[PDB]
Design an enzyme around this catalytic site. Sequence first.
Site, PDB file in Angstrom:
ATOM      1  N   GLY A  42       1.868  -1.319  -3.918  1.00 51.06           N
ATOM      2  CA  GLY A  42       1.999  -1.769  -2.537  1.00 51.06           C
ATOM      3  C   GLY A  42       1.368  -0.841  -1.519  1.00 51.06           C
ATOM      4  CE1 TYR A  96       5.255   1.837   9.685  1.00 52.50           C
ATOM      5  CE2 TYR A  96       3.017   0.987   9.610  1.00 52.50           C
ATOM      6  CZ  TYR A  96       4.091   1.593   8.979  1.00 52.50           C
ATOM      7  OH  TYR A  96       3.969   2.009   7.672  1.00 52.50           O
ATOM      8  CG  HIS A 144       3.157  11.735   6.929  1.00 53.17           C
ATOM      9  ND1 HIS A 144       3.401  11.551   8.286  1.00 53.17           N
ATOM     10  CD2 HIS A 144       2.317  10.764   6.503  1.00 53.17           C
ATOM     11  CE1 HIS A 144       2.711  10.475   8.636  1.00 53.17           C
ATOM     12  NE2 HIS A 144       2.038   9.968   7.600  1.00 53.17           N
ATOM     13  CD  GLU A 151      -1.290   8.182   5.176  1.00 53.60           C
ATOM     14  OE1 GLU A 151      -0.898   7.036   4.857  1.00 53.60           O
ATOM     15  OE2 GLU A 151      -0.754   8.868   6.074  1.00 53.60           O
ATOM     16  CG  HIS A 192      -1.218  12.009  10.222  1.00 53.53           C
ATOM     17  ND1 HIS A 192      -1.734  12.201   8.945  1.00 53.53           N
ATOM     18  CD2 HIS A 192      -0.656  10.780  10.283  1.00 53.53           C
ATOM     19  CE1 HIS A 192      -1.443  11.101   8.267  1.00 53.53           C
ATOM     20  NE2 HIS A 192      -0.799  10.214   9.034  1.00 53.53           N
ATOM     21  CB  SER A 194      -1.317   1.385   9.077  1.00 56.89           C
ATOM     22  OG  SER A 194       0.011   1.392   8.579  1.00 56.89           O
TER      23      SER A 194
HETATM   24 ZN   LIG Z   1       0.433   8.493   7.869  1.00 60.55          ZN
END
Ligand SMILES: [Zn+2]
Length: 341
Positions: free
Chosen positions: A157, A164, A175, A177, A263, A275
Amino acid sequence: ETLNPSARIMTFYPTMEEFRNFSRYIAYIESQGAHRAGLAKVVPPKEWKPRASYDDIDDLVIPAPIQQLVTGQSGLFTQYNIQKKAMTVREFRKIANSDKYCTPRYSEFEELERKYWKNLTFNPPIYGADVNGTLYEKHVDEWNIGRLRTILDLVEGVNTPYLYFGMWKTSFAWHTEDMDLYSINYLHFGEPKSWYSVPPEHGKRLERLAKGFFPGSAQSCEAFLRHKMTLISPLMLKKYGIPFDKVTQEAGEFMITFPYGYHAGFNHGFNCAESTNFATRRWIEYGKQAVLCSCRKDMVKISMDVFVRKFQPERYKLWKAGKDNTVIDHTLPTPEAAEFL
Ligand SMILES: [Zn+2]
Ligand SMILES: [Cl-]
Ligand SMILES: [Zn+2]
């Protein structure tokens, strides 16, 4: 090394011709050194629009809205989640714009940024996060977050779109990715979204600082920042010499995050962003060397075997045996950028 030596956030304005090929344009921005900052802004041409209007989404369901409770002092904070029952966009918008939760009065960004860091532990807001879906129409072929068609498609997924729904003071913690992949973020409508970024070449410096401030979290999990609970202010980063940059995203703009680019950020008010994750040939090495969360069973883990056999045939026998001693150079652009260099 000669391109973007300062490693600052770069902004791009492609023409409709340049914009048509997504994979080629990411290779171009890397040839200009955009990756060194770990975050880049892409303003699409005026004539491009992913959807005609957003007036038919009032009855769209947000399955798991989250109330964000924050604890801390002197620039260091921990964010905890409280999952609430399903609500509609209509219900979320009414809460976001009410006197209790609306954006405060301010003149310039620096004033709102001071108000955010001063009031983030008070009056907890609700974030309409991780909604499975897209707001792109079927016929849109350019930069379609639902179907980017990068080499990450070889997995299936993480390769699916997410929505959002934000309100004033909702936040996303420090964090990188999952599997240290790239990410794309489009701001569909509403108030801005402010971002902070640390260059990938300085990422280990941030990790060392975070481990020092949260010793208990470090023993329990090596990749504890992947839990997305740690908030650190720009003043705290400055006090401990961590290099960083800031940028504000407005409605109609794209943000690109790069491998091992840490970021964080916050929403100015009622808004909606879409996103997904993507990859290039350069990501393969980052994915083989990614430090993953070991305390949670439901964490994202991709097997690299397929990417190594297809794109690194010579090194597969060595890597599968454990002889791959490759050291990553964060300043080097993707191999696909050769035509621009
Ligand atoms: Zn992110
Ligand atoms: Cl709307
Ligand atoms: Zn963990």
